[model samples]
Target: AASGSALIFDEEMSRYKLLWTDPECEIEVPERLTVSYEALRTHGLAQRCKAVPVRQATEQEILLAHSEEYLEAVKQTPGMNVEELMAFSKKYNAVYFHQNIYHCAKLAAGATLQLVDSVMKREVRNGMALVRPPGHHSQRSAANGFCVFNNVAFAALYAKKNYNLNRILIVDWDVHHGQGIQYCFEEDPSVLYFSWHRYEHQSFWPNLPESDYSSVGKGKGSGFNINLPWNKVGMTNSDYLAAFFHVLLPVAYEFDPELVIVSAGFDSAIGDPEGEMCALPEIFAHLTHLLMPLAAGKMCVVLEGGYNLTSLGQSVCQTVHSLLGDPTPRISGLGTACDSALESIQNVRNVQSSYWSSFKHLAQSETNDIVWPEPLKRMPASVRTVVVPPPGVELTLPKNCQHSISESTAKEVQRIRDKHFDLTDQNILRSLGNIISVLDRMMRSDEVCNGCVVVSDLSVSVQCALQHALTEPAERVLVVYVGDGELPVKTNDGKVFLVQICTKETEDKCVNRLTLCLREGESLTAGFMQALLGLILPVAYEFNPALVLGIVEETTRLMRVWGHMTCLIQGLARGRMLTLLQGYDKDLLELTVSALSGASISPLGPLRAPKPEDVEMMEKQRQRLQERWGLLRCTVSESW
Candidate 1:
């Protein structure tokens, strides 16, 4: 979003593995980093990243999370005999000693610091570090869970001391609870920690009573700690998303951190023995994309616990693809989360309701067993953006926007004339034809990620695009029209899911089409965002449309919000997105293009409560559609 992405990896980190044959330690092997980094290289993702070399963490940096006694003890490992090594390793829980591990551990922590430095210095927008001995489970005074030092925890402390960042958010989404991270920051107000793990009522690894939903924090950080325990195995994509929709993002936006660090653990992904969760690899792409808009796009992803090498590598690729601003691939899954996930989400929200004002809408689920997502057929396009400008206007390129213009065919012209009989200019027809071509191309293949078409009348042009997008069999087009306009093409067809937001209260009715009325230019930015998260996204995900068609006007009051809308809606339809532009100034067009091109929208700073009226209106709409759109359901039915 800011510039290039920094990828930190040093092959030296993979030099150390378990010397003894221990099943507990063998899963955390050298191939974990090798497989993941190799996949990135094979997919052409590594070449796109600005490679940053990893360095060993100095004793001073290591002391940020580790104690002096632990450092001295680890220092003795280099010269220890086999008997000494065994005795020293036995002191720590689920940890083993290797001759080269002391150096590898330093580099693991060092690689994470490098990512943090890149983000704090604004050298790169955001980045991911391929480090081993995933650090979240490691404690302050002891090495545990195959970890030597808490890499992310050290980075947090270093960033605060060196960069003077006041607010930092640590998102630990590992399958196992990172109790070390919680222990380090439980009383620190500067860092807000959110973790969701497979607790199973403290029966999982690193099992502890504090892993339950009620362990908020002590002292100044009382409410800053958020722990959402996944009680059951075989959780799915819907369950994870439900937690984000109801638990994480709501409180996250309110916290408004200056820097965001994701404990990017892939064991939670499917096929992992540790996780046993059904969420596929593609889910990481969506999760990474969602977090990019936060912290002004200053994010550092440090790898943590992942055991299954196959699942781990795929997820690594997914995370990097998103970090590179690639259009997120559309994922297919029904919207219903597992019942166990919903109870955990409900408990977390209720526990921390007093701490966060946004978690007011406490929320989920049915039984979710395993069904693997098919291999993705529609990969991202090689090109980022394709632009069709209006009236030969000079549209300067970021990286020279790919120019794609299509002439109106005789059939399209005839259809336009016969459908409405409105007198049309030839140039307008040509513009409409170009838009139709883009959507049609998007439908046929993954040739291009997204595009922008400028027209004088967006209403006419979007409907024009929509008309052709539905030509494919079983195609569902989602038209997200913003700004004021008279209805162009009215449809009651179930295939067309149209959502219009405007200043004028032109409420339309249909099974799929709905209008959202905003107060007369009253800067309800927060209110508008609330609707996006709580209403639009849920319905859109449930609908699972084929292509997203955006018709937007350049309104200064809501220009920023529209940019975010463009970024968020790309999650649908395998990144097939089109923007029909009308009444747009050049800057507005640039903002939209940047978002479509996979840049994070400008920071959505601390969100305010939505206007009371807008909240009520959105709630009313949510209740009305929850029956029709099951994903939008928050409150469990009282029959239980």
Candidate 2:
């Protein structure tokens, strides 16, 4: 079931270029493909991927998204003279004429079909199609914005027609709106098209009024189409992440697509001449990681619009690294969203709240030109996961995990266990060795993702973890305890930030310890997901811990909710996690491993609006922390 990623491309797809001296069309040169593809080769990522061949998209295949008239018109371009080709292309906006463009465009369209077949056929789990003539901007009848064919749009149509998939999600992160994909699925609820673009009040290129935030889908597809318009430029990594944590991830989980297709455009990355945004390329890594947990990991990345060749190459490598399941680099200084981004998020959340259960809690609703550092080099370990079960705990370990506990690391773990719990209870010492062993690998930066260990005592094990993490490697360790009982730990010392989710009593201990109490009920859906996804996540992301330590309890019934939190939090701390279960339950441990190991969890089915009291509690929690934690503000003021 674990299939490696594939890169579907061919040099023939990049053989044609802009023939004339058109200033606007010059940036879409054939070098766009060569540089991006060579970057994968230079960074040694190309060799890791399964190389799939590209073929010309047959005429019948082009009809999935384009009209017969448009197809015939394009068919005639292959043999036309340069002047005639230019004359024919004059009607399309921003697209130029090359005699071989029709030939190259067929390869471009066919490259994505190969990617689709590779994913749907299980020959590969996920892949990126690096074909040029970016797809999303082209329409069914006319090419626009350097797009010859709608590659990603027809990809969805093909998948639905062939596979009979009920729900598919297309996420377009390009700076421009994917009007073609939006128009194709605007009347159908099956495919949810979510796009965040640089609108600037419709002054941007190919700017249409429909690209505004108000254009939800029509009729049966009323809520499927979502557009978050970026009114201001220079959106930072935090601004982009705020959109995902608050808007995309919540609604995505609720929508629960069967397959995910990303319009993987890096024009939104920093240093792009077109987008003029400040978001870093590594933000794509976390963005991809967040979406990987949905749809059973059946996701495809089709390259769209990215102009700056430098950032484009870097961004493509970052995305492919994540698709290969690398530990994501920790993005630093992730603070509050600007006034513009927060307002855009609230606008979409308010409009789409009626359709999705996840956004009902928000009652709701900046731009700064700032320099950001390039992402650090992420050194991924040879192994992805290392899990240590308690004594007598048998696990059919997943292929994603490493069963060996490294004897040298175990020696150091024994030393810590002997020093800390020399004369403690036997049950406390039973699982401490495994916990220390896993943490040893994490703190030392080896095998540092999706880790698990089963332990008996929550307080002693956590204190040991906090003491070891703070004094040595990680300066800031975040402890999220999801349980009922009280913990004998102090977090206001600023070394550790503790968030406890329980049914009962605890007073707030300043900015570090958050006691989020949810009302327990017989059939409650608001239970913990609303708090973790909306309320607690802002703090977790803003805090940006060196390592994330989770202490989960079975008594609180966390099997259903923990999967999402575990999957979402891996975006931080280099995807490093140390999860400790209070006691061993076979099912919970498996779920924990799946989320930690970056496995796609099942959809949260048919969740309605939460209890009003719980909603009030979460809303109050966000308000109380809005001042100290800037990311918590849903309706923030510009001057404040």
Candidate 3:
């Protein structure tokens, strides 16, 4: 309901600096804050935002995430000499101390809290605080990774205590994992924490095995913690987008937090020595825009780690620009996730599958029966001839007619008659029979490319089509069902991969199947759509499925969301997508037909937060399946 953005910053917070000559702490300088704030001003973003004054955090506020003994020790630093400062800095990992560090640290924490309070009270829709000494890596009793008191941690606690917020989501986009925040809320379900860091397996800094996706949470917070570890550097915009679409956004939506907090670290942007990622500064604009719909636009971003001055400044400007409700700049070259990125995503999904229902439907592994094609060898220039499609020769089918079947359709029907396709549900066979005919034509005829079929029994139609498709050269079939229904097929075999997006739990267990159980009364969410684009599309492309199937039963009213998803699927499958509709809803059929024809699909606008239970289910499932599916993993290889 809040309209404008808030800026929480003070030039005084720049007083915190590294006095000694520690290489690790040297990069984190006062310039990081000054340059970022100056960029906002130069770009006119700062003037547009409501400026909130900075204040030192109270002792009570500092005590929320720090030890009393540690707070007292930090207070004594301003009086310490250079020799004492060096000695004290050695106590905390990658941290430095100057005479005014305590004061600066308090201001950073207080500024973050102020921004959070402003957003929570509807004083502002969202805000960002540019402060010194990044906080996500700082712990309660000790500081680490060039951070002092955890600013975002304290803000989350403050919001909980003061506003009685039931749930909070902390998204750490820094290249370094926020171990401090993880430890702070590992056992607390009320807060969902997500971070993607440069892990390179255990080779990177903060090389703890727990930083891997497997360390979901503890006790009541089992699925609240999400971590995506980058095993390789040079990760591009595609990689970052992949993580959001597949891992972070999906769980964040399901968490449905009342407030959203971002540990907005720019190190992951291009030119940052720490992150070694190739993502441009403008990418942050898209990330910020993606999160604006959550929590009724109540979001807070606190500065974390970012060493590259130019990229950091640009990234900060982009973030603030998005926070001001501007249109996001279009990102280029987001073709596909790099191999390493896909590997990490799959691994995380494998490890977290048992916990999150969203992941309950991912296939355990590539089907052994399907032999993957080897990489094409380079040929002589003279022998290679490019054959481009003729102009206007696009795939298109006639509107709303179940006409005569094609050769492929007749073949599929013959196979079904011979008991090659096990369709146990006889009552829905007539409906599924027609649906399979459409799919066969889509697969065989270039003119009849992507098609959608509305069936009476979604489960039967899906099963029939999946079984029949596998009989082809398809080696593997990817079935994505977006509603609740009885999945009457065996998923243990790897030949068929199943992803069910529904609102109910299932008793069936299969390594090759993942069930995304949405929360009650939930409609389509941005997170789910993100998963469709990020996770589902990437995996489908990687698997190179012969056919892509989508099923929708509930939430059929979200035709636009379904249409968008179908468009994405059609693109991934090269127009080999077969959409199946259940029940005789004329409007649903028309919408499906329009979506398949590559028209009438709308962009995802603002959406409500997904249910917490659904988010928890997704988190749990990703952990369980990431190991089996390389695309679902979110960490580096063990060999690294």
Candidate 4:
């Protein structure tokens, strides 16, 4: 297996520059590559990567995605004069060609192929190629949107043929829709194509009705094509994260591709005049980190589009840093998704609910329909009288009843404390001992099948439980930490599986430990809880752990969604689930323990339907994980 990342680039590719002046072609300059590569070098990030040289793609290789007629026409560009070059470029949309552009185009396509080869051959775990004249906008027979050849499309075809890769995932993060690539694989179920671009209801560039959410795909590719159209600009980290959480990730995981190809475009970054969006450079770090778990970390990022040099350079550096397994930079300004973003998210979900099993329940729910404007008023000569019906009767719950602990439970708790727990701090030891005692009783006795432990130090208590669980006769142990904290156990062993859920960023990736980072203030959303129910639970079920351990920190206060997650987890592991809370909120702890113990507790609060953004977010996480856990492939109800 490859130990590090790869970087594919060549100075020769810069030879492809616009000889004639044009506003649309000027922004797609050679400096885009030079500045981005220089930024990586300035930060010493390039030194950490395994540098790979770019090669000119052969005619046969270029034919993998493009037609012979288009390739031959591009080859004739070198002999054309300045006026001839401009006239020839007029045939393609927003594209300007120079005498040496054909050579550069081949180099760009070859660079992408090299990166794909490195990843597929296990020469590198993942890689990125900085190429000129972005490719996602180019089609098999024609070029559009300043793109000459579709690098990602060709790489996908190359991987399938050379490596015999069955399933491939193509993620186009460019600000503009990759209509070229989308058209290439629209009918092929072997490849899942997902793209979110600046589409103001077909007002954006390359405007086509097919770019809308409703145009899923043709026939076999019906559910495979996912398009999230941003109706309005000024989109922030929240909007992008919301899209991933609710839409892209869920379907991606369900496809479970053997390889992942990222059309890494930074035009969507803040300060780009074309994108007119507010997403920061660091957002790419989180995006890259999110897809690291699939295909055993085999992913390749090919450059597509970015106009602003400053933001583009920073975004490129962030992506490379993430690919090199560095900790993600802290994301700022993360809040609820904007209203427009939520509307688009819901619209896409409603359109796609039928094709994917994961969205069936949400699709069937009435809430999935688009919200309409006020009803139209009509003139009426007369109104009909209607009879009023009596109100339905209300039911009341019985008064709370307390049950005494049995002598056998007490003895079992004491036995676990004496045999398993040993600590220097008396308070810590006592807290963990009490929690373990409850767990021991719950596992051995049928009175209360599940329980929770509230501790002052969650890290210490989790460590204690992990040690005890390792000594049990179970074949595997699963520890799921739902908040921010350093795990106090070794995660290298195959027998132990750890799933860390937090908003904080970390570069921890192992076969046994999977870190899922969410945006700030995201834990309260229904979409997040849906991920716990839909994504996390399915993976835990597949792992088939004998003992399930949960650690929730004080950072995420027990609320509506968290409460739902607690309830759902109790049902997993056959009621042998144990939870550890790191706070001294006596009332909260009591309520949580009672809930986990199968006792009815007061509702956390009145339930509100999941915001479209939240639902979209959960779907995205599901797409990211479905390939790993088959059980997550099913659709979940919108209601808790």
By lDDT, the best candidate is 2
Estimate, for each residue in 192-240, the C-alpha lDDT of model 2 and write its tens digit: 9999999999999778999988899999999999999999999988888
Instruction: Give the residue spans of candidate 1 off by over 4 A.
Output: 361-374, 377-380, 403-411, 418-422, 484-486, 489-491, 504-511, 520-523, 553-555
Total residue pair clashes for candidate 3: 51
- lDDT, candidate 4, equals 0.71
User: Which model is ahead, 2 or 3, in terms of TM-score?
Assistant: 2
Query: In model 2, which regions exceed 4 Å deviation?
Result: 361-374, 404-422, 448-450, 505-509, 521-527, 554-556, 638-640
Q: Which stretches of candidate 4 lie over 4 Å from their true place?
A: 366-530, 533-640
Candidate 3 residue 588 Cα shift, in angstroms, is 15
Error of 1 at 451 (Å): 1.8
Higher-ranked by lDDT: 2 or 4: 2
Give a tens-digit lDDT track for model 4, residues 1-640.
3657899988887777877678877788888889989988887778888999899899999999999999999999999999999889899889898898888999999999999999988898899999987899899999888888999999999999999988899999999999998999999888889999999988989898888988788898787888989899989876776677568766665565789999999999888989988888877876876666556568899999998888888888888876765534444335446667877887888789888644765654543321212211111111110111112312221122121134554464456557655545656656655655655554445444445556776666776677766765545677878777677878776777787877766666444566666554533453454566456655664566666777778773345445545544443444366677676554555555544433322222222334454555555555555545434443231434
lDDT of each: 0.80, 0.81, 0.72, 0.71
Q: Write the per-residue lDDT of candidate 1 for residues 402-489, one digit (tens) a residue.
A: 7674344546766776786575677767776787666666656556767888887655666667767777653677888787766565
Which of the two candidates, 3 or 4, achieves a greater TM-score against the reference? Answer: 4
Candidate 3 lDDT (Cα, 0 to 1): 0.72
Q: In TM-score terms, which candidate is top?
A: 2
State the lDDT of candidate 3 residue by residue for 1-640, as single tens digits. 3568999989998876777777877698888889999988887789989999998899999999999999999999999999999999899778888899899899999899889888888888889999987899899899788888999999899999999988999999999999999999999999999999999988999898989988999999998998888899988766887787678766765566788999999999888888888888877876775665556567899889888888888888888876765434445345456777878887777777767645544434421021212211111112111111112223233233233235555465556656745455554555555666665565555445555555665655666777667665566667887766666766666667777777668743545777766654544464476456445654554555667777777454455466556544543444466667665555666656654543323335446544455545654665566555555544454665
1 or 2, greater by TM-score: 2
Q: Runs in model 3 with CA error above 4 Å?
A: 363-556, 559-640
User: TM-score of the candidate numbered 1?
Assistant: 0.93
